[PDB]
Amino acid sequence: PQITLWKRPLVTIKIGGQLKEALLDTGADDTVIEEMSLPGRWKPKMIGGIGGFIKVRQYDQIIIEIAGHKAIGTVLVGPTPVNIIGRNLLTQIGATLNF
């Protein structure tokens, strides 16, 4: 699809068996999802943006379905105010910015 930017570029994702709404976010290096359980190993991480840093759990090799497209990669889980699909998974679905 071509998504214009008049509005937030929100899509439906499926992660850990759950449907969520998330932002397609070219400004995020990694994907960050609100608190949820995911299976497997994780390690703590700090990530920072406007307003400072939050602590997250880093899960590797997690499969997401993003607007119907499957991608695998790292997901950071923590108290983000918005679910964010970052570049580490946008690349996998072939997303580009065009102008």
Ligand X SMILES: COC(=O)c1coc(-c2ccc(S(=O)(=O)N(CC(C)C)C[C@@H](O)[C@H](Cc3ccccc3)NC(=O)O[C@H]3CO[C@H]4OCC[C@H]43)cc2)n1
Q: How far is the CB of 3 from Na ion (least distance, A)?
A: 29
**Segment contacting Na ion (CB under 5 A): 17-25, 29-37, 66-74, 89-97?**
29-37
Catalytic residue among 25, 29, 30, 60: 25
Between CA 81 and CA 96 the distance in angstroms is: 25
The size of the chain, in residues, is 99
Between CA 60 and CA 1 the distance in angstroms is: 28
Per-residue mark of binding to ligand X, 40-79 (x: CB under 6 A)? -------xxxx-----------------------------
Between CA 7 and CA 36 the distance in angstroms is: 26
